[PDB]
Design a protein around this ligand. Sequence first.
Ligand code: DG3
Ligand code: MG
Ligand code: MG
Ligand code: ZN
Lengths: 49, 79, 49, 1362, 270
Amino acid sequence: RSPGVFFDSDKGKTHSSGKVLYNARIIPYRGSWLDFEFDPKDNLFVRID
Amino acid sequence: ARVTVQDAVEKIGNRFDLVLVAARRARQMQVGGKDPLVPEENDKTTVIALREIEEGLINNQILDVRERQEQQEQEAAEL
Amino acid sequence: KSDDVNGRTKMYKNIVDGNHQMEPGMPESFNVLLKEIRSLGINIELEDE
Amino acid sequence: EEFDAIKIALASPDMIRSWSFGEVKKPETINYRTFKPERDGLFCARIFGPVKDYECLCGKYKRLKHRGVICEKCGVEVTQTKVRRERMGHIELASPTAHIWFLKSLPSRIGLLLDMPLRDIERVLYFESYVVIEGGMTNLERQQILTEEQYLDALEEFGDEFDAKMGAEAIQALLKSMDLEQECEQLREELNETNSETKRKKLTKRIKLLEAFVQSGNKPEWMILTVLPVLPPDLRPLVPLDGGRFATSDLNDLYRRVINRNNRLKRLLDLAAPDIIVRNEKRMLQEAVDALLDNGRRGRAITGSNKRPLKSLADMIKGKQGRFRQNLLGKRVDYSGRSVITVGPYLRLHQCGLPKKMALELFKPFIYGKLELRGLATTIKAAKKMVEREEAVVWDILDEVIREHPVLLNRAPTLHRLGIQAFEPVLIEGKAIQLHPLVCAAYNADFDGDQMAVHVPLTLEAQLEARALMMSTNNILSPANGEPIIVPSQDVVLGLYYMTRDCVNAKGEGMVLTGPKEAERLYRSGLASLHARVKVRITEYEKDANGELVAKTSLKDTTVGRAILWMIVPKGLPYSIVNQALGKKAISKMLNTCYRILGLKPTVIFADQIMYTGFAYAARSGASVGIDDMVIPEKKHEIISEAEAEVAEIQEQFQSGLVTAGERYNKVIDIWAAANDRVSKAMMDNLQTETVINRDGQEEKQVSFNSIYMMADSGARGSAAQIRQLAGMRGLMAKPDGSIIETPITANFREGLNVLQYFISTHGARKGLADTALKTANSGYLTRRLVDVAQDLVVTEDDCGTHEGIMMTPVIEGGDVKEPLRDRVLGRVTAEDVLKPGTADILVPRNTLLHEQWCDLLEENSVDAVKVRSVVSCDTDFGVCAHCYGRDLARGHIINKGEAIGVIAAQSIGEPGTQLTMRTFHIGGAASRAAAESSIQVKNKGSIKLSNVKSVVNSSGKLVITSRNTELKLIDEFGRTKESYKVPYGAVLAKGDGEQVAGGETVANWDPHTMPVITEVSGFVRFTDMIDGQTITRQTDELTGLSSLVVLDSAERTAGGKDLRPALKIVDAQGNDVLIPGTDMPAQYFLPGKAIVQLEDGVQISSGDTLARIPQESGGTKDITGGLPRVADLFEARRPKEPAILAEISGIVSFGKETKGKRRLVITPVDGSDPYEEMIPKWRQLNVFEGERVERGDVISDGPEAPHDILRLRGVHAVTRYIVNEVQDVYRLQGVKINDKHIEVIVRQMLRKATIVNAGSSDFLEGEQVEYSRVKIANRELEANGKVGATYSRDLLGITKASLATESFISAASFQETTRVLTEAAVAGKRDELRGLKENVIVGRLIPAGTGYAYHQDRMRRRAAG
Amino acid sequence: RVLDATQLYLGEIGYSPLLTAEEEVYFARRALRGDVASRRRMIESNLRLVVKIARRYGNRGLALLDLIEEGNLGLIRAVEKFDPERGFRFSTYATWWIRQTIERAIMNQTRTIRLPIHIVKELNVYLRTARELSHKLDHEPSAEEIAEQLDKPVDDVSRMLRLNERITSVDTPALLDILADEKENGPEDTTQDDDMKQSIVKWLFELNAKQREVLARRFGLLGYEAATLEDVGREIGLTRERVRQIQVEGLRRLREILQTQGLNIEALFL
DNA sequence: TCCGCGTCAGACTCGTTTATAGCATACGTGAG
DNA sequence: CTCACGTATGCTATAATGTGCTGACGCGG
Ligand SMILES: Nc1nc2c(ncn2[C@H]2CC[C@@H](COP(=O)(O)OP(=O)(O)OP(=O)(O)O)O2)c(=O)[nH]1
Ligand SMILES: [Mg+2]
Ligand SMILES: [Mg+2]
Ligand SMILES: [Zn+2]
């Protein structure tokens, strides 16, 4: 997977609610990964590494 | 027989018991050196026992009866 | 044919002697299994007749 | 040694000391210079034993003379080195250490025992926080955690009179102090006063734990380790590689960790170290022991040298790779070999070509033996050297040994029992094994490099079991279904087809022959074609009423070829068998017929003869494959341009507005699917006949002798589906998702693909190939779950004498009877004195075998329904009766007592799945599905019978159905059911109930794409709760502006609309609610996910109208990929996500309470005064209306039925029949024939356990789960003697749980979850008496089944005395 | 959610007091006199020094915690043999002790086959020499090249580098299943010995009773202790020359068995 | 959020990186 | 009976005293 940004989405999977949760993943060539993701309640979250 | 063992199954019935009885008889000829009732015709002890079962000479009950007879003859000799 | 150590040699001798008799025993893999479960601190005993 | 059972229990510190022969104090392994064991090290000879046989370490005592002589100087016993594999040691731990298995393994025993959460215990163990063990002052009670600062507070104030500690010492003290008796009584007192539903379970579970703990005689303190056992050296060996280097087990690294840290802890205690450092060392000690027992459970596993985690004790037992699956439930074997396989067409069915050099090696001891009896070899080493030299006399001896000695051939994978067969070997020059063609089917052997294992049965018993049970000749029929597995294919089929099939005139039309011999002589003389029409005189031999054969001579109008085949045909059979043009389908019937009339040896000979003649004439024929043999229809391009402008017009209509992605996808797929069939049928008319041959004068039509057509029609190889892709159109290809590509491949392989068509093909191809690699695993995992569940099931009894059975109807689905009742009850014991229609005389007895003859009588009388004895309803405890089962389908007669039925059942269900995975996938590219299930057209005249149907008459005049379950049947005159037809919801019927229709009439039309929501009442349409953006969505058009509404489900829906159900509500002109005829229900139709409504609010509807179109995208492809999960869901007894509701008790019902919309359906039975009240969702709509007298298990809701609810209300035969039919639906869709009785075996194993209410004279009380057989045994003695009667209720267990619920822990452990199984067994002090097969195979004993059943039953009676 | 043994311990150490110069002297005088609290406080306060040393020689063999514990053992010896009378600081003296005990433990525990410090120290010199050789010789040190530089024996250098050869796990990929039990004979070989042992009994009752007696008692076939020349002679009362006479006669009897059944003995020539 | 599963044999090859002070007395067994 | 040989426990004094891989399988209970 090329370093850069990638915007992906669990197509359902989590929560039989069946909500599409969108996420951004910033992938460097070297370093910690920077994740942004949505929660079922539409709250924006960050996962460092 | 030589090819197929269907006839010998038809004599005794249970395939499993056919195998036990043919085994017991083959062991007699293997160890005791018991003489075969049918001509050997260069046949292995496995096949000869099946011939004897097919023709209806060998059987669990018959083998038990002759075991008692030889065993009582030996008791007679010891006493 | 596999583990039984005494059994395999004894039956080899019988087959050269032309006895075609098995004389079975206890598979060494199982002896190991016992030792491996006792090494875990579980008492696993053989209960006699 | 010979033992009865095995028990497992917690190890006492002192028990561990018993096994030990010393304490290993030091980590020292061996001396670097003298590579001998160090002092009191891990390989200490003083502890584990001597390195060399009967020799001490310092070397003072040697030879077998010195026996048990412990050398005074070094301290080493003079015994065999073998002892170092058996002697154990131990380790004195400074700090008590918790045993991970009882701590971490869920649920956990230490936590459940103390009623203390895991978190609390861990804080205590890693020395984060103190726990109170006991305070007389209620100030601080029991098990209350104190932090470092919390401990300082109470310590000044109270102190002393309150005891709180940290680490495993604390928990061990807490375990020692806890009284199992008293807490049992306290917990019983709690359940008496206030039993809350969910916590009654948990309290009853801790009660069972406490009771079981005291009965086992296990002590809770022992969960914490004071003494740590050490595995014998040879089981963790340090050996020298050739390179001078050493190689050792990872257990040595883990033991050295534990010893170093333990000894360092002893040191720091001797030195009085400050407590922070002592604590660190106690943490590190527990870390090391937990790594040694089970590494990776306690968090991050300890990585050794590479980075890979060290393999710990538990890892050697647990995994598939552990010791169970790898070394115990299967092993590497002596007198075993392998090689590539190759054909032996010359062989007879009971023979196989075995390479000289291979056989020389396998029968080495047998040669040695004969060599010494002839006195040719003086001793064994001279015999060995004679074999090494491969002397000429040795070959002659080897030939003599192999005579009449059977050898086992095995091919991977072994899916079913015919994957092993015995043959008589034929010594051959060359390195390849020669396999008989006809058995290639059972092995699934094709000679493009496959290999086979060879195994030599050594004992007389093993030889006999191979010759009698496992011989090729004796295993002709599949044990799965009754049919012969030994069936001609490929060349053989093609040759017999070529011989039988007829041509116009040809050489010597209308000649006359004296018997088949004149015919053979004519053909071989070159005066007659095999296809010449002629009248020969053949003399058939028909069996009479007795055993005597009747001879009959008559003139027959057939062909030269068929006459010559009659020569192969044994006496007894009719000439009409060979008189047709023979294909593989007809030849299979031929061999089955011959087997049931004449018997085994004749069919064996006949089979070989067929193979020889089939190859022989196949080769004479010289049939081959030219490119001109692949004929393209002249009218392909027309069909395609028509289809192509049509699909183009729908794509242009897509931008306009009549089309969703799903609708157009369906419409384009339908157009291309019909075009493909058209072009294929054009090719097959043009190819199948289109033979213009001039008959003796003028022109005629007859069948084409085109090579590929003959191959297809005979069933020699390719099917019409393959030849479509060759000569016709390749068709619509399906993506790896299963969804089908919108652009089909117009071209075929003769025409050649272009770059784009080829690239598009690749998708389907590779998904197929990936499917074989990846999906095979789940098929195989299902085989293994089935096998484990039905291992114990053995034929135990001959006749239980039961009347009970499961009513089996004829599977008549989809017009043409899918599976006849005759074939479904063939070979099955009948019951309930099943006579003929006119009840005034018995026709069939209550205990007999249904032979082909009885079955043929059944068909003349046209019996529809027959109660037959089944495995499920058999009363036999600990097995099943020969009569309840019926015929051994593999033998063709009544099953033998002692046969392992369960295994055969599991194998036979498992095999097709596993075979159809690789098989359909590599072999096909595209998906040739047909979705056009619009109209029911009836094939034969009759009257419409509609069972289960509630429909409303629409303004058209037409009967529009609004039932969910609708079954249209076709009755004749006499009044039998002959065709069925599942009518759907939203259907227009042409004619109503009980009306006459003629042959080829359409009786009902419906749209397949879109299940419409059809309203019963007429009036105006109201939008309830249908807020835009909240619940629905709005989409507008141009010029005027047509809006369309799509119902967004909770998936896309906002938090605001979550609680709102959107529904189209029917109001009248006044704007009052219209009622549904005759009920209090107001009309309201709840719209699901993406219900696309056109017509906006306030539109006058008539009744019977389409309100809403829910899109029904069927992206499913017809394969086992989608099918097998359905099968696995059924066998695992899974409740679906929306179960349909059933009435629990018979009786008369009215409605009570409602929560907004949620129905609280109140049943108030007639006799049974207690009511039964149910909460029901608002949107779930009922089939039943109000006051009806409904019985147990009447369907209330729309939805699939849970097998649990079926069993619990209707009962055994109901649920068994539900499973059998729902599973068989899948396998039948793939053309797989499995007998119901196999599925029935496994369902019996599912219904093994039962929950009990009340007490008897034993220890039942409320809700213990015990096996059904054992509670029946109790009930039999109870009913005779009396005592407290016990109500029971059978429980369904789905496969995995059913296998773990078996009261053998050796079977449970070998299956799965071994760590959890052994902790629960160890704590219960469980005793396994070894009744099952897996148990006996593990200890290497005789199986309690087949041969072993005789011996095993003799041991069980030796238990009664001596 | 602090679960890790390491992070818990380092949290506990951080919670300690840091000592000064005057404080070190006061506590050290009380400590040598044998104060409980003084010893505990000096150790607890100087744990941080052990860690900065245990985290310095990381990724060398032993784990941090393992080295943190053995290093702590050096701290204790340091507090026991500290001289507060000397003006020179404690941290300086302790560093020696902590490094010594850690290094000693790393030389012993690390190696599965316990390697003696004598050989380990020699090995150190060989390896340091190899490093200097490698920097100037672009290639790597030979055994002979190292031996030339240290003026030591080639054989001694080779023995040492052989001991450097580290251990191959059998379970790490399994190697166990390839590598056979060399001490266990195949049933083929065991059956051959049965045939020989059985033949000997029959061979003993085929020749003379005077010679068979000698060979049976001497070889320990029917006997127990393999009596040498003098013991066999003393028993039968025979003489040393008589031993050679019975031996030569016994071999002639075997030659007869060989020309009869020698078909097996002549095959011993390959 | 955790932990339990995920076909069965066969062929071959490769492979077992690293750092450490130096010296004097003490502890203990073996050889001549 | 005595020394050499192999192995082990000992001590050293500028001050220095707080850490630290790979991520993402999927279905069920
Ligand atoms: N378990 C298992 N069996 C396999 C696998 N590949 C092949 N087999 C077995 C079962 C099918 C058999 C032959 O495989 P083929 O691909 O030749 O298929 P086939 O069924 O003979 O079809 P075809 O007529 O195309 O040759 O070998 C595999 O990956 N796993
Ligand atoms: Mg193939
Ligand atoms: Mg193949
Ligand atoms: Zn000794």
